[PDB]
Structure formats: C-alpha cells, structure tokens
C-alpha cells in the first residue's frame, strides 16, 4: 500500500456558547472521518458507509460508554489546566492520537495534547517521557510520569494496537482508501504560468516549475490541495514569468507512483 | 477469547513457584495478576504490557507478548502467599477477561 | 479511607424474592462494576458504570438491572431470584474505564444463595 495512517481528535471547550458543544471526537482514516461523538448526541457513530457495514452495534455501543467517561476526563483535565493557567472565560483543550504505516513497512506513533491550539505535551514512545511547552505542562509532565505503567501502556498501543486497528480498517475501506485515480493537468496563463492539477486520489501530490531543468523553489508560488466535493482533490502551483528573456519552463506532478512533465512551448 | 491457568499448584515453605497464564484474545491492552485470599476480595497484584521481567518485592511478573503468555514467580514462598492468584488480560476494547484463578497451596 | 464497602456480607432468597445490594467508594473513582464469581469460572461482569451518567450490560446481565445513583453509589438488583443466581457478588471500583492501567479495587463481597 501506499503510506496510511489513523487519528483520533478530542476538542474541548471551556464555556461554550448556546449551539457548540463541550466535546467533541472525530476519527480518521488518512483523510477520512471514520468516527463522530460529542457531548449533545452522546452517542459514537459512524462518518463512513463502510464503517458501519463492518462494524456491529456491539463495537459502537462499547465505544459510545468508552466515549462518555473520555468527555467527563476530558472536562476536568480542562478546569485543571485553565485554573493552573489563572485563565478566566472559554477556553480549549485538544488531543490527537495516533500512528502512520509506511509504504516499507516501518510504523510511527504520536500522541499529543494542545491548549488554545498551541503545542502543550507531546509523547516520545521511544523515551517514554512528555515534552512539556511551559510550567503548567510541566505540572502534568511529572504527574503522568511517576506512573510508569501507563507510559508503558502508551506505547505498547501506539506501536501494536493502534496498527492493528488501521489494517483491519483498510480492508473495511479497501475499495475507498486503496483505489489511484490519477490526475488532470493543464497549464493556463494568468504574466503567469499556472499549473492545474484536478479530479485526483489520494490527496498527496507534488507539483513544481523548472526552468530549463533547474528547479526555483523560491520562485515558486504554491497552491494549496483542496477538496472538490465528489472524493477527489485539486490543487496549482504558479511562477512569475519573464518579460526580458524567454526560458524552456515545464511543470512537474509527482503522484502515487508516477511523475509526469508539461512543456510549455 | 479465552484464558487459561492451571487450576491449583502445590510447592513447599521456602522454595519458588511459577505461576503460567497463557491467553488468546481479540488485541490486547495489559495483564494484570489479582491476589485473592480464601473468603477475601482480589487485590491488584502486578502489570505487565511491554515484554521483559518485572520484580515488585520477592514477587515477579514476566510477559511475552508475541507467545502471548505471562507467569507469576513468587521467591522465598511463605504460608501467607497461600491463596488465589487470578490472572487478567485487557482485550482490544478495554474489557477485563479473566482466568479461573490458581490455588496456590504451601507445604509447610 | 474506606475503599469499596458493599452490603449485606450475607443473604439468604427464596425463588422470586426481589432483592438489592449496595456499593459505595469513597475513593472518587469514576468507574464501578458488578462482578460474580462462581466456581470453576473466572469472574464475570453484570453491569458496568463508566462515569456517573451511564450504564451498560456486561457479560452476563439476565435477570439483573443496575442504577447509578450518584457519583459514588452503585447498586445490583435482582428481579425474580432464581436458583441459578447463587453466587459470591463483588463491587469494584478503577479512576477511569479504557485507563490500560488503571487497576480494580474491590469490595468484601456478597454471598447470595436462591433456594427453593
């Protein structure tokens, strides 16, 4: 396969407003949400058709309970924080879980916590210790330290039990997930060169300019990788140019295996 | 998923004793051994969720994942450490399955 | 510091008695379980209550229903007795529920025999 990879988030707000919720956790299949629960529902339900397809109402009555205690620690970790922090109004507390599976086999594995969208306390399951970003994540640094065991067990799920769950969803989503639809490209003027690259999955996709064989990463203004709405992406790439001089120009697309060039005559 | 352990062990005062629970279970999430005494509640024993040996006190646990297997090694047995020993395995949704116990039975 | 402290230690059910048992921890966990233990089995759960606000079955919860009353109380009650209901019942009690090690304290224990 190509290089997957599978995340859990968990948001939190403070004092929310009359429709927000409190809590919020959303699972991810590469790009894919796979996974939903927040605090009004109550409820973890699934966010892809082949999810529930192979999933029994076991699994999600289990997780729905598993959910329920996860919003109640996510809100007191919250007030811990934000009494800690001298913080008065709504603020919010974030969590992303998860590991990547390479192309050659190799794993990954990352768990990390924010605070007002910023870093706060990021795993090392190879040290086994937490990075803490300012004296309040010190705080928790050192508590969640001194019991070793649950570092340990971090791990042990990051490095095993996290990949067993992504291969067991690849096959679920194997249609979605492992399909190659390859790319559309054209070049269309704008004095700029624009190369336009659509109706492509999955989302990874390199486009550059070269200039008679030699690359201007400087020079070149990058488009970002945008969601069309029908399950494949789009995204451009520019460069400035010359009045004073011509140049052999020529876009490049890497994608899913294959590379391609246009020529700009 | 299934557990098993042997359902009761005689050694004698002073020796050593091993303790074998082997598991096959849908992930997995830890092992914990309970120490019960006869007409008494299980208290925690020890953890284990990584491979390697791990002495608490004169007691020891040791886990091998990939054989799926742990064993409880008690050193220097006394009377006292005459009762139950239940071994615990957290499956790949945190649910607790359990073994019937091991009667751990000292000749004094 | 109490721990988990159940009632009654002792009963004794003719078949279709209705029938409660308490459980408390003074602990401030979050998580409480009701377990039977049997000869020849390993423990099973009855109910189980991951945070005070929500219950669900267990293992083996015919004949059984649960009520969390707050964030410390937890309560077993037996519909119609039967027979096949006589066993030792233990409360327990961890912080949290998915926690991979937080362990599970425990309470003295109830032992119940339905007779005919």
């Known amino acids: 396969m190509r290089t997957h990879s599978l995340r859990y988030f968990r948001l939190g707000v403070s004092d929310p407003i009359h429709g927000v919720p409190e809590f919020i956790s959303v699972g991810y299949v590469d790009s894919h949400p796979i996974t939903t629960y927040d605090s009004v529902t109550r409820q973890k339900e699934p966010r892809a058709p082949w999810m529930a397809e192979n999933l029994a109402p076991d699994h999600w009555e289990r997780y729905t309970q598993l959910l329920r205690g996860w919003q109640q620690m996510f809100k007191v970790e919250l007030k811990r924080l934000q009494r800690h922090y001298n913080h008065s109004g709504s603020h919010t507390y974030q969590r992303m879980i998860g590991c990547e599976l390479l192309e050659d086999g190799s794993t990954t594995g990352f768990l990390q916590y924010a605070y007002d969208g910023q870093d706060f306390l990021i795993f090392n399951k190879d040290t086994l210790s937490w990075l803490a970003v300012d004296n309040v994540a010190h705080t928790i640094k050192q508590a969640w330290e001194a019991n070793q065991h649950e570092l340990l067990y971090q791990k042990n799920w990051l490095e095993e039990e996290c990949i067993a769950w992504l291969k067991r969803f690849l096959e679920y989503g194997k249609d979605t997930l492992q399909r190659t639809e390859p790319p559309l490209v054209r070049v269309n003027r704008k004095t700029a060169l624009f190369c336009k690259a659509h109706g492509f999955y999955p989302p990874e996709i390199y486009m550059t300019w070269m200039k008679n064989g030699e690359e201007i990463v400087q020079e070149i203004d990058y488009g970002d990788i945008l969601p069309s709405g029908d399950g494949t992406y789009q995204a451009w790439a520019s460069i400035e140019l010359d009045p004073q001089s011509s140049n052999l120009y020529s876009c490049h697309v890497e994608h899913s295996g294959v590379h391609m060039v246009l020529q700009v005559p | 998923q299934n557990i098993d352990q042997p359902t009761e062990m005689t050694a004698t005062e002073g020796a050593i004793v091993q303790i074998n629970c082997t598991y096959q279970?849908?992930?997995?999430?830890?092992l914990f051994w309970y120490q019960q005494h006869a007409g008494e509640a299980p208290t925690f024993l020890s953890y284990?969720?990584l491979d390697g040996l791990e002495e608490k006190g004169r007691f020891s646990s040791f886990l091998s994942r990939s054989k799926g297997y742990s064993y409880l090694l008690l050193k220097e047995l006394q009377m006292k450490d005459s009762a139950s020993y239940l071994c615990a395995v957290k499956d790949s949704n945190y649910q607790l399955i359990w073994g019937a116990g091991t009667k751990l039975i000292i000749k004094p | 510091n109490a721990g988990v402290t159940q009632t009654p230690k002792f009963q004794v059910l003719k078949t279709g008695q209705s029938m409660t048992l308490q459980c408390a921890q003074d602990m401030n966990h979050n998580s409480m379980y009701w377990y039977r233990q049997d000869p020849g089995m390993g423990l099973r759960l009855i109910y189980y209550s991951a945070s005070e606000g929500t219950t669900d079955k267990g293992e083996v919860p015919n004949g059984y229903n649960v009520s969390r009353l707050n964030k410390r109380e937890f309560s077993l009650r037996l519909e119609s007795a039967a027979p096949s209901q006589t066993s030792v019942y233990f409360c327990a009690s961890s912080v949290w529920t998915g926690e991979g090690s937080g362990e599970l304290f425990f309470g003295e224990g109830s032992r119940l025999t339905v007779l005919e």
């Open positions: 284990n969720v």
């Open positions: 279970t849908s992930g997995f999430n830890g």
